[PDB]
Amino acid sequence: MWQQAIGDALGITARNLKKFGDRFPHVSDGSNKYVLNDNTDWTDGFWSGILWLCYEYTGDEQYREGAVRTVASFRERLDRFENLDHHNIGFLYSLSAKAQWIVEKDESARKLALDAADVLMRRWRADAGIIQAWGPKGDPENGGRIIIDCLLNLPLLLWAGEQTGDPEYRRVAEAHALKSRRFLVRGDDSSYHTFYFDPENGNAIRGGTHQGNTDGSTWTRGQAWGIYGFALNSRYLGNADLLETAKRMARHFLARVPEDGVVYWDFEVPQEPSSYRDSSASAITACGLLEIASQLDESDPERQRFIDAAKTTVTALRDGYAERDDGEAEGFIRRGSYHVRGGISPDDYTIWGDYYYLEALLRLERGVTGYWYERGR
């Protein structure tokens, strides 16, 4: 049921590793070829994650060799502080260094992840009670701005807190998650992409976006980050409110899935075939649904409902968006969208979409849950 889908991903990944060399895939731009970078974006960890997932599925050393090489690259990136002045250090290091620790208990990798967590920790702004998403401290326009994807960066901090015994990691993480729940999530279970607070006292200002159609719309990837993000934090914190919020956001998302099973880029624009899609949002959501289900009681009927919804989503992606390993294609799923409003790769491969698609497949086929937390916690 999932073996063939995984098979194509394995083949594409093996071919990619040889062609990419030491470079990292980010997004495609009008073709079936990825545009590469030298480990300088916020998405490099997804490549590492893909390699580790392929290794766990196959046991094939070629995938491990590639993943280990990316980890060495990440040590170099950290000790040079190259393009790490943002909150996505979790996306970058959880799926690379922490991943290696999770997979084979490499002490060197564990330390790298901890060093990275230390850097992310310094993004906390005590006066505003939030983790600053982008820019330098005191940033005139972004100093008190949070973005919903920060939820996916909290796992690195929560993991580090458990590893070190330092209570500050969990304190900042839970505070940020709760502030996100009150202000990023809406009363109809939809969500804002970003939210602005007063840098001096942390008081709420407004919600908005530079990516969603409008400040009050529902950017699907943002909703997806909320679904998986709140569920990951609920697991670490044992916070039933965060789990409830994840479920609410999931139901909102599911009620707006179009005919072919994969979402458009925003729920509040015409849900028409000529409009851009965001296969990555559906992939992220599939993982989030399975994560939520894993935290529900076996007697809870909604548990199987969420699992079935995840399966339906993965099947929809496989059937209408998945690339077959034809020796040319470099991505797992088509029609992801980076920045529709800016016209940047709006109908393309996205390395994060590929990672979540594969993670969903590994979850369904092997019970492999990715690298957001230790296996058995």
Neighbouring C-alpha atoms within 13 Å toward the C-beta of 98? 29
β partners of residue 45: none
β partners of residue 301: none
Measured at the alpha carbon of residue 358, what is the angle toward residues 146 and 308, in degrees to the nearest 5?
90
Q: Are 310 and 290 in contact (CB under 8 A)?
A: yes
Closest CA to 375 of 99, 117, 160, 49: 99
Q: Are 16 and 329 in contact (CB under 8 A)?
A: no
With 0-12 CB in 10 A as exposed, 13-18 as middle and 19+ as buried, what is 119? Answer: middle
Q: Are 26 and 37 in contact (CB under 8 A)?
A: yes
Helix (H, G, I), strand (E, B) or coil at 27: strand
β partners of residue 197: 204
Hey, what amino acid is at 306? F
Closest CA to 350 of 50, 64, 93, 82: 50
β partners of residue 266: 219
With 0-12 CB in 10 A as exposed, 13-18 as middle and 19+ as buried, what is 128? Answer: buried
Helix (H) or strand (E) holding 64: helix 61-78
Structure tokens at 364: 């369904």
- This structure's resolution (Å) is 1.5
The residue to which tokens 């008190």 are assigned: 144
Hey, what amino acid is at 351? I
Helix (H, G, I), strand (E, B) or coil at 243: helix
d(CA 2, CA 106): 30
| Cα 224 → chain centroid | 9
Structure tokens at 295: 């935290």
Closest CA to 62 of 124, 16, 130, 108: 16
Hey, what amino acid is at 15? R
The residue to which tokens 């040590």 are assigned: 75
d(CA 338, CA 50): 19
Q: Are 370 and 15 in contact (CB under 8 A)?
A: no
DSSP category for residue 344 = B
Cβ atoms < 10 Å from Cβ of 106: 17
**Is 1.50.10.10 the CATH classification of the domain at 1-377?**
yes
| Cα 51 → chain centroid | 16
β partners of residue 277: 264
Hey, what amino acid is at 262? V
What is the secondary structure of 107-118 as a DSSP string?
Answer: HHHHHHHHHHHH
d(CA 343, CA 29): 10
Closest CA to 126 of 113, 143, 148: 143
The domain segmentation of the chain, as residue ranges, is 1-377
| Cα 197 → chain centroid | 24
Residues 6+ apart with CB under 8 A from 8: 322, 323, 324, 325, 332
Helix (H, G, I), strand (E, B) or coil at 192: coil
